[PDB]
Amino acid sequence: GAMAGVFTYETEFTSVIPPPRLFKAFILDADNLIPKIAPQAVKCAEIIEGDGGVGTIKKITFGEGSQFGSVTHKIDGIDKENFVYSYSLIEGDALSDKIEKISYETKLVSSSDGGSIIKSTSNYHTKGDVEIKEEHVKAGKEKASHLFKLVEGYLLANPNEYC
């Protein structure tokens, strides 16, 4: 059979919002928060199976900004105490004959200046010859970035929320 491998890519960015509020809002309430503040980004998020914990399958339908496309995610793990959230891409444009799955990890690490470091790990499950383009990968890193700034901007404007 064809060669199975994992291509791992790691990216980091900072936030003025510390991990508890940021993980509660940006991670745990993404289904409610993002459609509400960025409808052009996320139209809706519907749970296909499960209740919200590990093993939950959910479809995220994009707004006009992503031509009303969609992704299907499986929740691999949630650590509310360590601000870690793992999920896999089980249906999406990023998948192909070459890339059968993409496992993701988002970790919120605190800093002594009262903020967060948002560490994102992308694990591509490859089949056969590996041909991962830097432009294709960075388009997903760029993607997540422009949206987080809408989230950050809203949390700063609404301090009473997610306390």
Which domain covers residue 156, as residue numbers?
Answer: 1-163
122 pairs with which residues across the strands? 9, 104
Mapped onto helix, strand or coil, the DSSP state of residue 59 is: strand
Method used experimentally: X-ray
Structure tokens of 25?
A: 């809002």
CA distance 101 to 126: 8
Number of other residues whose CB lies within 10 A of the CB of residue 52: 11
Closest C-alpha among 15, 41, 45, 2 to residue 106: 15
Residue 93, domain CATH: 3.30.530.20
Write the DSSP symbol of residue 10.
Answer: E
Domain count, the chain: 1
The kind and range of the H/E element at 144 are helix 134-157
Beta strands in 63-158 (DSSP E): 70-79, 84-91, 99-110, 116-127
CA proximity to 95, closest of 56, 44, 136 = 136
How many Cβ atoms are within 10 Å of 107's Cβ, its own excluded? Answer: 19
Quote the Cα angle for 48-82-56, to 5°: 10
- Listed in sequence order, the residues at least 6 apart from 157 whose beta carbon sits closer than 8 Å to its beta carbon are none
HSE, side-chain direction, 13 A CA sphere, residue 57? 5
What is the arrangement of strands in the sheet containing 42-49, beginning at the earlier edge strand?
A: 4-15, 116-127, 99-110, 84-91, 70-79, 57-62, 42-49
Give the Å distances, CA to CA, from 84 to 3, 105, 109, 159: 30, 7, 9, 23
Strand partners, 123: 8, 103
Provide the 10 A C-beta neighbour count for residue 85: 21
Q: Any idea which residue has 């960025």 for tokens?
A: 38
DSSP SS3 for 12: strand
Tokens 């590990």 sit on residue: 54
